[PDB]
Amino acid sequence: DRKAPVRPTPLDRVIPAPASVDPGGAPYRITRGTHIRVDDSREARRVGDYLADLLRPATGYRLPVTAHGHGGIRLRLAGGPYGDEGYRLDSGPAGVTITARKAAGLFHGVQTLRQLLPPAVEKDSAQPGPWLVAGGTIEDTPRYAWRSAMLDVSRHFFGVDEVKRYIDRVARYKYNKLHLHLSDDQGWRIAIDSWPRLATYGGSTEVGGGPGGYYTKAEYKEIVRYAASRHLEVVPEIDMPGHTNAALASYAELNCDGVAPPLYTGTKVGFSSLCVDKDVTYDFVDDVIGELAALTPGRYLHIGGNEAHSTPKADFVAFMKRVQPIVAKYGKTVVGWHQLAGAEPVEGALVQYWGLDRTGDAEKAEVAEAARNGTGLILSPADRTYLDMKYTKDTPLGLSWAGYVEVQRSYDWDPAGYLPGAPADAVRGVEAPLWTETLSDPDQLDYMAFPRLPGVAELGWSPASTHDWDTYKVRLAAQAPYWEAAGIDFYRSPQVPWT
Template structure:
């Protein structure tokens, strides 16, 4: 350890003693370390070292790639988790060598080129733990795996007794698909910033790297737009069933984007159009073809609203709204919806989507749209998100054949707002019941006829909120199905096995209990006693 590292370690220990928080005493009975084979999503390879364990102690430090603030930030997040639950100082210091001899090292060297930008290599010996990657995103992914290899109580908000052992061996891991998403609908019921941040933390643990925020719909507009202020102030003033609704200021949206980015999650914002627009139409009469603003809407039926395709003001509106959103969003995508536009003729829909795609491109972004968008001519950079309930769709297959990338979100497999069964209090059933095995039992790369693996950008699990009002509701519908979708997006198809998965998933139960996640205790999953 460097001299600076020793000074920092001493300072932190003194601070802990002064605050009355003592490092946890070593525990004598050593519980069995968590198996390398228990990780969700399943790694590409996991090779255990029999009889080898590493123990995190009060002397453990976290060593980081020198000169990399991004790596130091990943290390800081890990240290915060470990300090909270172990009571140990866990100083974060620059590594003095690319070959660690003690502690936990996060290094941008030594990883195979094959793991790409998001993969990692994790080595655990009796002396040290080394996470190696080519980019900080890979180190973040490796840290999420390391968290799962520590006892579930490592996620505790208070100091626990330990021991803090990690099973020895090597994991080499990288994602199958680039896009591994979760969609959160904040339009039907508004969800505060704190809830969104909590969900980001929960999805990031399972290597989900996209948060699709559904920011507008008939029932509410959830993002402040300076050039059209009534959208948020008036259009955001209600939600399904009534209530006060709400919206994010631009500063709050920036907070969400930054919080997600620190966890290697890219925010993909959606402004749904030309349908699902009653909140906008109610906010500004001039957006309507007849110049008359409809009333605010708090129901759940869809397909009745549409922007006025023939008005040039409509495209000025879209340009200004998407321009502000593009400036707030560092990622390459803007989602423009495009689904269920049944009040728009096919010709008008094609005209509208052609203009809208060009506007998005003018702001330096690429379009994502629900798969309905392939019914209009699409730009080569446009991505279509399949939400259907069938395994064939000629127009989507044709688009894929022309080079359009597809995000797979079949509603009867991946929609987290579908009920688990007929007894589920929350959710809907129009796409059928989705138990955990249904969510897991499909292959995104071979699901839709004519859409091969190379055409699939990835997977996404949408959570619509017609019946969802609280964080507890969100968690109950997302867990344990979200980790199932996450594994389909990350893990090689060769690792997909229901028997193995339901056991590994069950092992997450004690961790969720410690984290306070309100999850559904599916009878299909082997949950440990007490979880």
């Protein structure tokens, strides 16, 4: 009875592990006449319609969303100790109620609810159910405010619909930020009016050659809108000064030797660099950042800064000293990979640490020092949360330069004491990056994203006290029938006792 359990799933059996779970009493049962009651507001109805859409196909029920009556499923905004993202979920024969201070909290509550329901909820046709929700109370709030997932759309391009699909994958686990790697050596994926060829030429191909692609302003705005409806703040990244071949290949004038390199379709890194000695370089950067900021309702702008191996240290420092201020000029908060820690991060900046266990002490120290100096830290270790890394030497996709990363390794650590010498309060959160040198279609993204994606979300959300591999793997194992029913391919790790 994997698909349709006789009894409801435990109230605590959800990912991320809720901060507080108190089971008790009988469960709630959704029946054909259940109404979804919300407050009389645009945002309230929005979360209501979202929930209704998730349930209607499998239940076959009408599930009307209204601001009147005592619906069996109630979503209500009210004062409480749940912050901007927390919520309380009460379940019993009298109905299910999700309470929170803001819509994001109600949305997160819904993500928990879909896990309390049986695997059959993932189907597209009416299912027998039963649509049981364990009885009790859940009070949930996040540990970290930065809980993101990154999708590399530069190595292999993924269109708007494919990005919306990935957005829905991550929304399941309460991630609240979507980092889009919009440019690299193999492609430039966002239209810039001031520099037209970046997209029309720089986005013409991808890894392996053939058709590439890019987002027009309208397409990008739609991705941002959709992400916002899933409560994901979009963090766009235009990598500089390295990983800039797409731009360099588009405008010869940007190159040091004034010669535009060919479009790149390989899978290596570190060979490209903007010419730090030319003034046109900074006009280019200013125009791009200004236009990107205009399309970014979010608070952050990622300027990358990684693997600029063709940029001498001194030039890299000079470059960053000059470009960082540009971000604030357009009202945004700068974010960069941890190499930025060696180039004097400006006030308010955040750096994304992608180091490994084996990374040298000197490098880790430079990052820890930045944290001491007030720089916020986003943790995404290459040997922990890089979803493109192989599980084992036999994995058919992905890379292995950072070693192999099985499910336990990806999950089994604590962000608070990860980077030696780094102040715990400097850690803003975590991120799970999905690089695409080896992934060209949505199904391949899923196989590399699952089952590690939920684990990283837990690290960003759950209390340290709830962290434990032996009990977590049981909760992860329970996701099997849901993913199977949803058509989400995933790596059946032998470390997990799959249900």
